[PDB]
Amino acid sequence: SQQVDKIKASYPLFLDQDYKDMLAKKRDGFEEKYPQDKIDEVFQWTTTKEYQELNFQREALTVNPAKACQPLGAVLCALGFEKTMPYVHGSQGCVAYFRSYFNRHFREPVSCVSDSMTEDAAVFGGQQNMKDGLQNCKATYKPDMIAVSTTCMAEVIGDDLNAFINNSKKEGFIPDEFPVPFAHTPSFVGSHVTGWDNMFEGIARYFTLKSMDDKVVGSNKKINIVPGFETYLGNFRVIKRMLSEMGVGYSLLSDPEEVLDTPADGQFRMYAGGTTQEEMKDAPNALNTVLLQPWHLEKTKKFVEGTWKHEVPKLNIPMGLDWTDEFLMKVSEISGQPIPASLTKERGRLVDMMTDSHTWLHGKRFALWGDPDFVMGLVKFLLELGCEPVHILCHNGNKRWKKAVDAILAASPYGKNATVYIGKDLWHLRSLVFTDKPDFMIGNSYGKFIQRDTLHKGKEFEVPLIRIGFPIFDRHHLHRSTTLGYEGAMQILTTLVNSILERLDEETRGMQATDYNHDLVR
Amino acid sequence: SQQVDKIKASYPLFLDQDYKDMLAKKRDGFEEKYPQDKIDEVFQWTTTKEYQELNFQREALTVNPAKACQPLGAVLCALGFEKTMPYVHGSQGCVAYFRSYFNRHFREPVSCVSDSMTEDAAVFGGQQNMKDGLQNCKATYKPDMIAVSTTCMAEVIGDDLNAFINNSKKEGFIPDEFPVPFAHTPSFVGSHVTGWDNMFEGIARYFTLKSMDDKVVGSNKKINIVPGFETYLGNFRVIKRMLSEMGVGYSLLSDPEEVLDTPADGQFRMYAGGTTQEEMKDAPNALNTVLLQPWHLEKTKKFVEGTWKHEVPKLNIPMGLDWTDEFLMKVSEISGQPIPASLTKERGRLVDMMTDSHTWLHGKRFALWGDPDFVMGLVKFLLELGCEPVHILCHNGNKRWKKAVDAILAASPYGKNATVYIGKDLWHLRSLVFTDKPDFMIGNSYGKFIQRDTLHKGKEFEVPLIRIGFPIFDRHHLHRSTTLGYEGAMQILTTLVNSILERLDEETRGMQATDYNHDLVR
Amino acid sequence: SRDEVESLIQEVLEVYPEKAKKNREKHLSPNDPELEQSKKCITSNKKSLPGVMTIRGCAYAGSKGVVWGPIKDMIHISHGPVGCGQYSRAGRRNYYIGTTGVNAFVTMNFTSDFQEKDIVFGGDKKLAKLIDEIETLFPLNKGISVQSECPIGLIGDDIEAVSKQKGKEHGKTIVPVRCEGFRGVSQSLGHHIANDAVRDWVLSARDDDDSFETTDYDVAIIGDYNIGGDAWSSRILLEEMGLRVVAQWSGDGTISEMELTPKVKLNLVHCYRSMNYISRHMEEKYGIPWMEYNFFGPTKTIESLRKIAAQFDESIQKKCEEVIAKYQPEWEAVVAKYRPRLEGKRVMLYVGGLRPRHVIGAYEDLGMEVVGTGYEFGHNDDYDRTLKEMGDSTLLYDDVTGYEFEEFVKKVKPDLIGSGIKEKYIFQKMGIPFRQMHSWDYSGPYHGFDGFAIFARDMDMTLNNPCWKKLQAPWKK
Amino acid sequence: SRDEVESLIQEVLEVYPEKAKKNREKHLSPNDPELEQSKKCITSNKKSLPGVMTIRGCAYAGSKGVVWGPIKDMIHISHGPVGCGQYSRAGRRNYYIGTTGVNAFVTMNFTSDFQEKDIVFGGDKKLAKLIDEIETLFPLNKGISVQSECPIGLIGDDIEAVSKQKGKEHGKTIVPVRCEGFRGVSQSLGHHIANDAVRDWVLSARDDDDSFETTDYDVAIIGDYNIGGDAWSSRILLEEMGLRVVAQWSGDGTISEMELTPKVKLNLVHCYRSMNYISRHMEEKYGIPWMEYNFFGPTKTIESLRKIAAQFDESIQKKCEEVIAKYQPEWEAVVAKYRPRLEGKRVMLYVGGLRPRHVIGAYEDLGMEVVGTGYEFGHNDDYDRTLKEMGDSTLLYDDVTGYEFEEFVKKVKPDLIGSGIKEKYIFQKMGIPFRQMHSWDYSGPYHGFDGFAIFARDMDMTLNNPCWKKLQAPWKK
Ligand code: ICS
Ligand code: CLF
Ligand code: CLF
Ligand SMILES: [Mg+2]
Ligand SMILES: [Mg+2]
């Protein structure tokens, strides 16, 4: 039943007695549900150190992964290019998901197409699809470029993109001059971030490889910036801001900040901004090339050092204080430009905020997950703050990366209780936060079910999620934040401290019980 | 008792049985405490419509005000001037508090002095104090200027600042050329915001009144900006940013953003940035003067229109969409400069965010308090979002202002259930949120005790506080936010929607109870 | 008129090459309500054109996402590379009551996470081991499904063998499903495969077990996946009408309920597209009739209630009228508040296989008018049922492209559009109110009398939101 | 060296005019531990120099903020203009247990909120009406205080008359306090006034009431305002020593407890500065002795415990040693963990009237060294007790200025400073670890054995925080 002056949605509609009674009868009548006490027994069990030992002996089953396919990262990469249409060779089901996934994170349209390969292509291969696809795509959406990725299906049947693209040109499905860079993006290797790397190197080789004779390092007096898989718009913008502020010439390669933040003005803009084709062709002439996320830009790096002969600096992601410092100083060295007073002041303000907030941050224990670069950046910053990163998880990490993180932990007293987990999933993490309870989790929206679970055991066992990462679907507009540089450091610091104080308020809010400590001034 | 490996602070230390038992014995032994049943009975009573009727019939007693003294605003005003020392004529106890109050909000040093008047000054007046004070102050802290305010003591004694300052010059306690603007700031009139207005007009008259012969409106090709009492650093910065972006010459009069955000680099900077003396002297030559907070700049406006002959535009605070629009268009008109594409796009992005978030914001009921301009800005913006401002309270408001807000409510369908309260306090508000429960409160840290109270009645009656206003003492670094312009609109929108979603998560987090609606995607 | 639409189509169709233009003209038509057979107007359930940005998904979405994933007490394995499972994880609001992680698993993602090893050498051994790990770590599961992603068939794995063998080892129902993305053209075949998997592996479990106590008033809700609790707001009305809802498929559904469904007297089918196959099966084998119903808006909820009651005695028919009388003042208040605010407004819909015709009645009950509708994966028997629902010479579009949908909207200039997440933020930039007709815009339910209130509120909040009057800057005039 | 300090002082003192330089040289001194009389080295409790940015507050802070406001079951009216009450509202962490708004009122702000009307015409009538409104809206209050702000005396209001008259009307203790900001030179007189108000209006209430059951072990904690629960971590030790703490003044204190204090056997005074006045009074009238104690760090907590136990029989003395023994392994562990990390480090303190000498013992117990200390409003009998506490030729400063405190720090270069909120963010910018020694940096308690653990942890966390090694940019070197 509904009162019209206060209409109820699913919640709290279904809390009405009529509904509660119905669901009781459904359960008892037909569901043949285990008894509540059996359920409580098993739930208690899943929180034990015993269950964890079994959990961590898994070898086949993955539960609640914290990673995605290669092609996802390929799409995001391609979207950073001017009037470029991401195009994925294979099954159309993939593109439906890719678009949705990004739709929900960015709350923006996301343009991408498929070959729509079917059963016929299993036997005969996907040549005809590529031809008709490339043609139709170009005709219908008027891209200036089409960046080709693969679904697993295409990879397994062993389609040759290079041959398939060329035959499309040869047979007059696409103009010969029309730019169609490509990359193999098998979902059964690496992760979304590996897809970004493969696409990007696919695009950089298309515009440069053949035309390297006239190229001269330094001629354009700029620095190339490769950002990698980035889902915070503040991160593209902050880097641009800091380089402008330094008076450094730069070229941001794969720059989607405009197309994922078009205004609502009465027009639909399918394409907007992006790295130009000429920016790519001229890229070899840059002083140097800097990779913001080195741990997923391994193939890109090999090509830049290898073919463009740029001495790619050994730089960590510019997260936190030390790695933003090191980033800025490298650029100063490469560019000849001094670090300006405005950035020295910004730095000073971050440090001021650290001094202002240290008492609450000190010794707080955290579990965190995400992509390797992000995660290690976060770890580093937590250690600068005096926090304890207790459970560090990277589903798409490796022993080399792990070793690099273990080194960072070893260099700090705050890393004594830290442990790094690669190839593990949020079901593994769930265990860790029950047996070795932190204060908070930092990670993506998938961490809300862990919080749900920890509450179920009791309020004193609840581990609150702080949403930093990707995807974030259950909050609005957090995709607009910054995690890089001093600005990103300041936003994170604020989120961490205020998450601590928010929770402390919640615990002290009980009247004549815990409110002795509900201080006005923290 | 303490375990050294996990030391406990007040919370949760005093939840140990030994302590609980001790406090039970303290209570029963010596406190002669009312019975818990009586207490629960009265608590229940304070939540009723009956109690509210009594509450609202108050005539002498004020409980939990939402306002401060004039001199507070005077100090904040003065701090916006270059190498200026705020100096307050009267009792030193006042300055101790003024400094603390700001210390806790900004987490920055706050410089201010007193002439330390005592009982002797009640009889003989505070002449000698002013003389020695001005001398000592200048000698010790090397200000370029000293801005003089009053404590209530001095006002009641009837000290004449003008005469007292002049005799200090006449008797050689300070140089004659040394600038010592002043203003009467009686705490028993208006509020902190009235103090800002009086100080500012005090400063503007000092540098212009006598030197008005050579002045010509428009000579400057600039716009004066008077900001009023502002405690968000983003608000000073956003206006500066938007004017630069427009290519408009501007003069921000009282600009403390630098001195309340000095870096931590190893130096203590007592003074930093500020409106220059020359900027003040040249102010009359501006095209025009715009007041960001017109409802507490009544005296300033009379002086600007009156003496500088500037046609001050009738503009609301630039909060939300329509009033940022109107602000930018006025500046375009006054300055001759078109509104640039970057700001048209920023506008478009705010509107995008409104379209993206409307479903959650629609029909949410809010109680809010603060200073008049801020409050009406907030109200306006809530109405643009489709929210219902149910309880609007301004302790330091007036019938003319109330009428202006009632007009705004009447112009929108979302103002049907709104009510405006002037001269009421947070104890009045407490009643309102029990009898006519909103979804959230918007206001300063003092609203946490109201939230505490509403929870005590039950979880379904809890009204969560969203901290926007001043002071904010129980969170860190929210003083860095923006409330003005499109930027401020976007920060608020994000805060409001995510406050709704955070609370919805909390309500849906109960397993097999309400978690049917713990959606991954919001 | 008809010729105004017929040349709208031709204008939009100019963008395409010769081969593509021929395909799409068949999938675009004005509505003719007097027509009996929809094959004369439009074609459907054909291959998508490569590179035209279809809104369609795959068979795995149809199987795992739609049919199987909703069953709470079963664990559903996304068998293949990590990906399909991640994007489908809690993407769909098929609501349920359970202790997630313990006795229900809907919003979890179980996957084999194929690497190269497993593509090269096949993942039959990995699948086997994986099932053993589930049984250890998730003892309260009452069954397992294996949702084949694209590689499984391509590498020639025998998941049927593993399922049988591990099924007898652990004494658990393990259902293999060949819902590989590349099969079929859309979600539609995924449904059909999923349906057939239920038949073959689950439904016959209690053929020789009549211990369950039956009545002549037993029914099953078939093809209601309980988006935002739609099935619950449906169920409550049926049990208030004096019927017994023995099973729900598959929103808040369970295996015991699926096994019990062959014992009911009538199958009440909400979604024909997804679940007609198994309904027909139960009519063949078990002799159970089935009828289509519709709980969108008062007009259809009432029609449906009575049409159902008429399949029983006059006791149900009486209870039916008590029910309709109970809710008359509730929906009448809704129409009072909102119809004024929505009267005359024009809508364009694009959804999957059902809702393009079903929701029409609800709009008409708020004085709105659907002028454009289309299905993603709908068949010609879906268009047969849309004919009389839609107005004369309104716009029909099967498997509409990004280009086509946008171009159409610009000429038609609707007040509101109802579609999915990929189309959402496009039309919000053009300044056109948008409601999601899959996820309900994270609202609902929209079924029944209790849902109609929410539906109305939601259309009003969006169509008349103050944001829409603000898209153009005052100065750019 | 003494001469290295004596010319440090003269260097800092150069900035001042002739008149100011003379005043401040009296208020700045090297410490001489062999001296008996502090008037030979330093002067104190004199008027502040105008315009030198003293850290001092007023008599109202001493009365309302320190002494009276902590009493939970009383309502305290800030009588005058709106501000003083607003800035003092919940500014001080005097902890308590109650239902705030019902039976306890500590963190609330009650005020008369004077306008011009009330300055011109006086607020005696307003105060009267205000008290009636309290009695209606706050029936469970057990008493009322009236804290005079600056105007009250200046306009010649008779709050004594109103208090008496309304006191007899409502049958409640209503206490008028003349704590007007302009009286005295600091918080110190505010205390004295507040103390005298208690005597005159509260303490004698049970002179002819011996119904209260007494023991030989009854005591009162006097001058512990329970910052962060300091009084509680103090009390628990006294009750474990077999004493009965009949009253606390005024942290978590109550009116009944104040009234009961003349029945105790001994007054245990933590803060001499604030509450020696009333202690002396009770020795005169009621014959109750009193002694100073100190529960900062093990060394003093032990000394104090034993010194107190020695005032009773051998039963207490025994219980004392049980207590000491119970907590020995706890504080020993604290010293084990932290002393290594803090050994050798140098501190400068500046607080109000007590803590500049009291906390020294706690620092020395973690191997630290206080090299600079000063009081805001302390008297010469406070410096008398600081003499032997501080090292030889360490730095003493009464009513230190902003300039002086900064300049001193630059030469001394301490590892840590302990002071108030106004000094906090100054020294954090210079790169010098800072702890608040009023509010405890929103931590605590720091008293007792349970407090010492927290104290140690807090000093370590701040002094060795990683933030401090990062202040200078790598490039600007
Ligand atoms: S009362 Fe005094 S200034 Fe003895 S006015 Fe002040 S809560 Fe200080 S050194 Mo703030 S004489 Fe208490 C004090 Fe000491 S407010 Fe507290 S810390 S022990
Ligand atoms: S059509 Fe459908 S969604 Fe596509 S794969 Fe095939 S079953 Fe799945 Fe999967 S991991 Fe990624 S999204 Fe694909 S490339 Fe493979
Ligand atoms: S020394 Fe002390 S705090 Fe000062 S007034 Fe006097 S009692 Fe009070 Fe009050 S309202 Fe403002 S802060 Fe002052 S000018 Fe009056
Ligand atoms: Mg958006
Ligand atoms: Mg600071």
> Which chain A residue's Cα is nearest to B263?
A348
Q: Which of B263, A125, C430 is nearest to D471 (CA)?
A: B263
* Separation of CA D182 and ligand 1 centre (Å): 20
Which among C92, C235, C270, C447 is annotated as catalytic?
C92
Task: Decide: A180 and A146 in contact? Cβ < 8 Å.
Answer: yes
**Domain layout of chain D by residue ranges:** 59-184, 218-320
B347 to C466: CB separation less than 8 angstroms, yes or no: no
State whether the beta carbon of D12 lies less than 6 angstroms from ligand 1: no
D475 to A329: CB separation less than 8 angstroms, yes or no: yes
> The tokens of A106 are what?
């960015």
Does residue B187 have a known ligand-binding role? yes
> Which chain A residue's Cα is nearest to C330?
A2
Does residue B1 have a known ligand-binding role? no
CB proximity list for B464: less than 8 A, separation 6 or greater: B440, B441, B451, B499, B503
Does domain D218-320 fall under CATH 3.40.50.1980? My reply is yes
Out of C52, C100, C334, closest to residue A140 by CB: C52
CATH fourth-level superfamily of C218-319: Nitrogenase molybdenum iron protein domain (3.40.50.1980)
Q: Supply the residue whose CA is at minimum distance from atom 3 of ligand 1.
A: D352
Sheet (strand A62-63) strand order: A62-63, C110-111, C75-79, C144-148, C174-177
C47 to A116: CB separation less than 8 angstroms, yes or no: yes
* Residue A376: CA count within 13 A, CB half-sphere: 27
Task: Decide: C428 and A264 in contact? Cβ < 8 Å.
Answer: yes
- Taking the Cβ of residue A17 and every Cβ of chain C, the question of whether any pair is shorter than 8 Å is answered with no
Q: Which atom of ligand 2 is nearest to the CA of A96?
A: 3
Amino acid at residue number D475:
W
> The tokens of A488 are what?
């990103």
According to CATH, what is the number of the domain B320-363+484-522? 1.20.89.10
The answer, yes or no, to whether the previous bond of C250 is cis (omega within 30 of 0) is yes
Q: Which amino acids of A are annotated as binding site, given as ranges?
A: 69, 94, 152, 187
A477 to B456: CB separation less than 8 angstroms, yes or no: no
The experimental method, as deposited, was X-ray
* Separation of CA D75 and ligand 4 centre (Å): 52
* Separation of CA B352 and ligand 4 centre (Å): 6
CATH fourth-level superfamily of A364-469: Nitrogenase molybdenum iron protein domain (3.40.50.1980)
* Separation of CA D198 and ligand 1 centre (Å): 19
CATH fourth-level superfamily of B215-319: Nitrogenase molybdenum iron protein domain (3.40.50.1980)
State whether the beta carbon of D227 lies less than 6 angstroms from ligand 1: yes
State whether the beta carbon of D438 lies less than 6 angstroms from ligand 1: yes
User: Chain B interface, mutation test: which of C470, C472, C476, C477, most B Cβ atoms within 10 Å?
Assistant: C470
- Specify the 3-state DSSP secondary structure of C244: strand
CB proximity list for D419: less than 8 A, separation 6 or greater: D55, D349, D350, D351, D405, D427, D434, D436, D437
Among D94, D221, D354, the mutation site with the greatest number of ligand 1 atoms within 8 A of its Cβ is D354
Residue ranges with CB less than 5 Å from ion ligand 5 = A 352, 356; B 107-108; D 425
Q: Which ligand minimizes its atom distance to the CA of D188?
A: 1
Spell out where B320-470 has E strands.
Answer: 365-369, 388-394, 419-422, 440-443, 465-467
According to CATH, what is the number of the domain C59-184? 3.40.50.1980
CB proximity list for B312: less than 8 A, separation 6 or greater: B288, B289, B290, B291, B301, B304, B305
The H or E element containing residue C76 is strand C75-79
The alpha carbon of residue D26 is apart from the nearest alpha carbon of chain B, in Å, by 17
Torsion on CA atoms D158, D163, D164, D170, rounded to nearest 10: 150
Is residue C231 among the annotated active site residues?
Answer: no
The H or E element containing residue C395 is strand C395-397
Phi, psi of B190 (to 5 degrees): 50, -135
- Taking the Cβ of residue B49 and every Cβ of chain C, the question of whether any pair is shorter than 8 Å is answered with no
> The tokens of B228 are what?
């009023």
> Which chain A residue's Cα is nearest to B259?
A349
Q: How many CB pairs under 8 A join B and D?
A: 329
Is residue C457 among the annotated active site residues?
Answer: no
Task: Decide: A191 and A67 in contact? Cβ < 8 Å.
Answer: yes
CA–centroid distance for A376 within its chain: 13
> Which chain B residue's Cα is nearest to A104?
B521
* Separation of CA B115 and ligand 5 centre (Å): 27
Q: Which residue has the tokens 């920016």?
A: A279
The H or E element containing residue B240 is helix B233-246
Catalytic residue IDs of A: 152, 156
State whether the beta carbon of B151 lies less than 6 angstroms from ligand 3: yes
How many angstroms separate the CA atoms of C406 and D467, rounded?
A: 55
State whether the beta carbon of D295 lies less than 6 angstroms from ligand 1: no
Q: Which ligand minimizes its atom distance to the CA of C180?
A: 2
- Taking the Cβ of residue B347 and every Cβ of chain C, the question of whether any pair is shorter than 8 Å is answered with yes
Q: Supply the residue whose CA is at minimum distance from atom 11 of ligand 1.
A: D353
Resolution (A): 2.7
How many angstroms separate the CA atoms of A349 and A326, rounded?
A: 18
The alpha carbon of residue D475 is apart from the nearest alpha carbon of chain A, in Å, by 7
Residues of chain A with CATH 1.20.89.10: 320-363+484-522
User: Chain B interface, mutation test: which of D55, D75, D102, most B Cβ atoms within 10 Å?
Assistant: D102
- Give the DSSP letter of residue C149: -
- Taking the Cβ of residue A510 and every Cβ of chain D, the question of whether any pair is shorter than 8 Å is answered with no
Q: Supply the residue whose CA is at minimum distance from atom 15 of ligand 3.
A: B152
Q: Which residues of B touch C337 (CB under 8 A)?
A: none
User: Chain A interface, mutation test: which of D446, D467, D468, D476, most A Cβ atoms within 10 Å?
Assistant: D467
Which among B95, B110, B148, B152 is annotated as catalytic?
B152
How many angstroms separate the CA atoms of D465 and D461, rounded?
A: 5
Q: Supply the residue whose CA is at minimum distance from atom 7 of ligand 1.
A: D225
* Separation of CA D83 and ligand 3 centre (Å): 6
Residues of chain A with CATH 3.40.50.1980: 69-214, 215-319, 364-469
Task: Decide: A487 and A458 in contact? Cβ < 8 Å.
Answer: no
In the 3-class helix/strand/coil scheme, how is chain D assigned residue by residue? CHHHHHHHHHHHHHHCCHHHHHHHHHCEEECCCCCCCHHHCCCCCCCCCCCCCCCCCCHHHHHHHHHHCCCCCCEEEEECCCHHHHHHCCCCCECCCCCECCCECCCCCEECCCCHHHHHHCCHHHHHHHHHHHHHHCCCCCCEEEEECCHHHHCCCCHHHHHHHHHHHHCCCEEEECCCCCCCCCHHHHHHHHHHHHHHHCHHHHCCCCCCCCCCCEEEEEEECCECCHHHHHHHHHHHCCCEEEEEEECCCCHHHHHHHHHCCEEEECCHHHHHHHHHHHHHHCCCCEEECCCCHHHHHHHHHHHHHCCCCHHHHHHHHHHHHHHHHHHHHHHHHHHHHHCCCEEEECECCCHHHHCHHHHHCCCCEEEEECECCCCHHHHHHHCCCCCCCCEEECCCCHHHHHHHHHHHCCCEEEECHHHHHHHHHCCCCEEECCCCCCCCCCCHHHHHHHHHHHHHHHHCCHHHHHCCCCCCC
Q: Which amino acids of A are annotated as binding site for [8Fe-7S] cluster, given as ranges?
A: 69, 94, 152, 187
According to CATH, what is the number of the domain A69-214? 3.40.50.1980
Q: Supply the residue whose CA is at minimum distance from atom 9 of ligand 3.
A: D84
